[PDB]
Design a protein around this nucleic acid. Structure first.
Ligand SMILES: [Mg+2]
Ligand SMILES: [Mg+2]
Ligand SMILES: [Mg+2]
Ligand SMILES: [Mg+2]
Ligand SMILES: [Mg+2]
Ligand SMILES: [Mg+2]
Ligand SMILES: [Mg+2]
Ligand SMILES: [Mg+2]
Ligand SMILES: [Mg+2]
Ligand SMILES: [Mg+2]
Ligand SMILES: [Mg+2]
Ligand SMILES: [Mg+2]
Ligand SMILES: [Mg+2]
Ligand SMILES: [Mg+2]
Ligand SMILES: [Mg+2]
Ligand SMILES: [Mg+2]
Ligand SMILES: [Mg+2]
Ligand SMILES: [Mg+2]
Ligand SMILES: [Mg+2]
Ligand SMILES: [Mg+2]
Ligand SMILES: [Mg+2]
Ligand SMILES: [Mg+2]
Ligand SMILES: [Mg+2]
Ligand SMILES: [Mg+2]
Ligand SMILES: [Mg+2]
Ligand SMILES: [Mg+2]
Ligand SMILES: [Mg+2]
Ligand SMILES: [Mg+2]
Ligand SMILES: [Mg+2]
Ligand SMILES: [Mg+2]
Ligand SMILES: [Mg+2]
Ligand SMILES: [Mg+2]
Ligand SMILES: [Mg+2]
Ligand SMILES: [Mg+2]
Ligand SMILES: [Mg+2]
Lengths: 129, 101, 103, 49, 132, 165
RNA sequence: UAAUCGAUAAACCCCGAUAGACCUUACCAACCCUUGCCAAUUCAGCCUAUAUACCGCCAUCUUCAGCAAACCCUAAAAAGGAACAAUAGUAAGCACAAUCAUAGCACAUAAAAACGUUAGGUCAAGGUGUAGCUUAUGGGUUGGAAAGAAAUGGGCUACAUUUUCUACAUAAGAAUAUCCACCACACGAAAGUUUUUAUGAAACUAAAAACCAAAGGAGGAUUUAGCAGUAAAUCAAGAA
């Protein structure tokens, strides 16, 4: 485990939001238990919610050649879990999200939105042209 | 071996439509512009007309990948309903279930 | 030989076969070393062209188009504007006959 | 690419790695088709003769 | 009558795995899924390629392992690597088994240009859920 | 059918305890005083919204990744009255008038670093050209006004005529 | 017409098509090419004949309660086999039922629906048994089709006052088939004709204006569909 300290001022995040998409509920429940218990140990101070499910339904003809009065109806359900972390560092972010991501289940996908804190840019500071 | 001669000619239509693509885009850039002269547009007209019509986008036909069925194709899986249903029913298709509501 | 599953993962990752974490979808693609003002501002290649003519109308729409485009690098955009120079100067007769003197 | 999967698996078959029961059905059936005397004519021979 | 993916009633002697004893309409109720990947979720891409991959993996696993494949093939896809899980009968001696394990892992990692991992679990006789 | 079920076994809570205790060394601390959003605003006014998506398959390339968002409160900018309102009229829809939030969505470039640099570029540019008064700004129509100025009004001349009579 | 195929009583008829200007494309008209897609093969390739040879998918009886191995009885047994103050029947299997889905119940709908029947449907989803084609029943280019004298099934819009216009969302204003010479208008042009515009290499397609305003005045025998948030009416979305 090689650790090194660069003098540069590590990035801050106000809100690290993690979307966990799934088909099944159970896996996301367990994974929630996992991310919660992992973010408690590191004292990351997080919340979790359930964004309402989205269901897509499309229909195919039931027979090879012709009966159009008969249809098969197929379904894809996507269920949500969102982890909301507030007031975290850049390194804490890279580690926690490394640990959370390496173990991510096969049927589930993950979308992360990071709002990162920057003071102001240089040409804007207090010059006027 | 591609499963049909159909899929043969359509594959050659994908290669071709990728090849002359730049030519298409740049010619049709002027041809569809109002500000430019009509005279550059008649010549640009003869120009995209000169290209082999096997390289144009709309001559391409979406088919099922494995079974080649020209119609009844589900865009996202590129699969005919026969084969789609077959695959999803064995549960070989992930997430696809029978709809009840 | 392998001592652990972690040894497996580790070696796959050093080898570059296993993915990089936490994943950035841009890993392995450097985009030629380019920056936005090489993408957004196409003035460089609009230098040689008639300035007040409608050729600037057409080429400013082409420019503003190649600016909005994430799907192409510097190189191919430049090949576009260059093919346009080559073709516009290719026919000197049309431009002049059309009723506007064009350089 | 269908040429890829087709040729690759056929090779792997003759190289004795992959096993195709479909091609074996086909083969055995053309064996019992030609053994019968109705084969696939050598090119150019069938029509005129 | 609905004929999709079903096993008809015999004189009552026909040996049947839990897998083939459940009609398509049971999927996600009782039946799980044979293949697992991100592609059919709400916001995601390239379901088609994971499907082609799936199909060819069926063909490949059934042609590479003659007569010894017990139940239908379980495909997992995680962090770009494929975990291929197969329940397989005991037929051939361990030598040929590891030969084909290494062989398959290599050829599959290299064709699909991504790391493959193969798990075989051996079973004495085909698992029978019903009849018999 | 137990072979298809994801096994959380490797993630069993003992393993999470030990893993997060061996991962205690990589993480870096969070600053005390920043504990409230107020001091976060007084200190760092700007938010940068970055999107990261992971899915399974051979390829890592995600189209939606590139999008960069900037959220800047206009109250935290050094802007003049003239600069602030010329900026409202300049940027427009990117500006929310109730909460005072300015939003820049940047797309056009392949790499996210480039969308970030061009978004902060748009920020600097709009700020530098918000302070430049030009010829046509003295040509300002009174219909263009975000306010009703009592000077040079119609109600003013109605008042002066009513008081004339 | 030189110019596809298939479905065609209930269980065909906006049907395979959740989709033909080229393509799709099987078709016809000419022309061209014969180890003619593949690692190899006296071998490829065949939307050629067989759905009365079949696998796959289905229709239907049917939202019908049964169907079937293992046995056991019947002065013979083709076959049948229950009576609850019970007279020879016991039976695991599979239907139905029960649970699941419709984000809690309950209901409803959805799904489920065995065995067999209709040699019901499809060798054009694909795959094959049998027969055929192999300088052609194969593979390419190019152009060509889909015309109405009718006959009919299904729809959409109506025939107007519970209507029509504009505002508009649910108190408003005007129009209103006969005055009569209106400088015609009340409803009703989705149809035509012009000009645009969408897409496209190619308008035969689609959309919007203007013009035009025709049949139609609630329709013969005879019939469809619906028991509640249904019918009916109004609106949007998606699939390709
Ligand atoms: Mg098309
Ligand atoms: Mg039915
Ligand atoms: Mg016909
Ligand atoms: Mg017929
Ligand atoms: Mg009939
Ligand atoms: Mg019939
Ligand atoms: Mg109908
Ligand atoms: Mg045609
Ligand atoms: Mg033919
Ligand atoms: Mg016949
Ligand atoms: Mg039949
Ligand atoms: Mg028939
Ligand atoms: Mg049949
Ligand atoms: Mg019963
Ligand atoms: Mg029995
Ligand atoms: Mg009996
Ligand atoms: Mg329930
Ligand atoms: Mg009920
Ligand atoms: Mg039902
Ligand atoms: Mg039931
Ligand atoms: Mg029933
Ligand atoms: Mg028949
Ligand atoms: Mg066939
Ligand atoms: Mg055959
Ligand atoms: Mg031919
Ligand atoms: Mg043709
Ligand atoms: Mg009639
Ligand atoms: Mg209606
Ligand atoms: Mg109506
Ligand atoms: Mg009124
Ligand atoms: Mg009209
Ligand atoms: Mg009229
Ligand atoms: Mg009349
Ligand atoms: Mg009646
Ligand atoms: Mg209704």
């Amino acid at each position: 485990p090689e650790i090194t300290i660069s003098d540069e001022p590590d990035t801050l995040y106000k809100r690290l939001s993690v979307l966990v998409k799934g088909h099944d509920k159970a896996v996301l429940d367990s994974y929630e238990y996992f991310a919660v218990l992992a973010a408690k140990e590191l004292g990351i101070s997080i919340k979790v919610h359930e964004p309402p499910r989205k269901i897509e339904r499309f229909t195919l003809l039931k027979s090879v050649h012709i009966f159009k009065k008969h249809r098969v109806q197929y379904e894809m359900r996507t269920l949500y879990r969102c982890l909301e972390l507030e007031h975290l560092t850049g390194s804490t972010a890279d580690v926690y999200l490394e640990y959370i991501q390496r173990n991510l289940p096969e049927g589930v996908a993950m979308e992360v939105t990071k709002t990162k804190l920057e003071q102001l840019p240089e040409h804007i500071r207090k010059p006027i042209w | 071996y591609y499963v049909d001669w159909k899929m043969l000619r359509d594959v050659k239509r994908r290669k071709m439509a990728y090849e002359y693509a730049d030519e298409r885009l740049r010619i049709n850039s002027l041809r569809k512009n109002t500000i430019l002269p009509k005279d550059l547009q008649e010549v640009a007209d003869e120009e995209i007309a000169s290209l082999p019509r096997d390289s144009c986008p709309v001559r391409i036909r979406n088919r099922c990948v494995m079974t080649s069925r020209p119609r009844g194709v589900k865009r996202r899986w590129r699969l005919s309903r026969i084969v789609f249903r077959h695959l999803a029913d064995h549960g070989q298709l992930s997430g696809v279930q029978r709809a009840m509501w | 030989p392998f001592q652990n599953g972690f040894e497996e993962m580790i070696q796959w990752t050093k080898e570059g076969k296993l993915w990089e974490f936490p994943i950035n979808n841009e890993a392995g693609f450097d985009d030629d070393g380019s920056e936005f003002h090489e993408h957004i501002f196409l003035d460089k290649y609009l230098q040689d062209f008639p300035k007040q003519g409608p050729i600037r109308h057409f080429m400013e729409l082409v420019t503003c188009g190649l600016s909005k485009n994430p799907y192409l690098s510097v190189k191919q955009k430049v090949e576009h504007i260059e093919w346009f120079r080559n073709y516009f100067n290719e026919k000197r007769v049309i431009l002049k006959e059309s009723g506007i003197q064009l350089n | 690419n269908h040429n890829t999967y087709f040729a690759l698996m056929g090779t792997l078959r003759f190289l004795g790695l992959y096993r195709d029961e479909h091609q074996d059905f086909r083969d055995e059936q053309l064996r019992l088709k030609k053994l019968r005397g109705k084969g696939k004519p050598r090119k150019g021979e069938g029509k005129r003769a | 009558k609905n004929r999709a993916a079903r096993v008809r009633v015999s004189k009552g002697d026909k040996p049947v795995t839990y897998e083939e004893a459940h009609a398509p309409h049971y999927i996600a109720h009782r039946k799980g899924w044979l293949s697992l990947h991100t592609g059919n979720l709400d916001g995601e891409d390239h379901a088609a390629e994971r499907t082609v991959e799936d199909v060819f993996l069926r063909k490949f696993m059934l042609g590479t392992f003659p007569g010894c494949l017990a139940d239908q093939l379980v495909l997992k896809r995680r962090a770009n690597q494929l975990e291929i899980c197969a329940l397989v009968l005991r037929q051939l001696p361990p030598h040929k088994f590891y030969f084909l394990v290494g062989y398959s892992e290599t050829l599959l990692s290299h064709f699909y240009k991504c790391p493959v991992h193969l798990h075989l679990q051996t079973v004495p006789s085909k698992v029978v859920y019903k009849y018999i | 059918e137990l072979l298809k079920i994801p096994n959380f076994l490797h993630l069993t809570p003992v393993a999470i305890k030990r893993h997060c205790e061996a991962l205690k060394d990589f993480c870096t601390e969070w600053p005390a005083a920043l504990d409230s959003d107020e001091k976060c605003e007084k200190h760092f006014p700007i938010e940068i919204d970055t999107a990261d998506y992971v899915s399974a398959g051979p390829s890592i390339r995600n189209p939606k990744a590139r999008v960069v968002t900037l959220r800047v409160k206009l109250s935290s900018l050094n802007l003049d009255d003239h600069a602030k309102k010329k900026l409202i009229k300049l940027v427009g829809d990117r500006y929310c008038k109730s909460t005072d939030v300015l939003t820049i969505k940047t797309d056009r470039c392949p790499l996210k670093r480039q969308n970030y640099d061009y978004a902060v570029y748009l920020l600097t540019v709009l700020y530098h050209e918000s302070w430049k008064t030009e010829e046509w700004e003295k040509k300002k129509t009174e219909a263009d006004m975000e306010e009703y100025i009592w000077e040079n009004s119609t109600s003013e001349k109605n008042i002066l005529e009513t008081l004339l009579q």
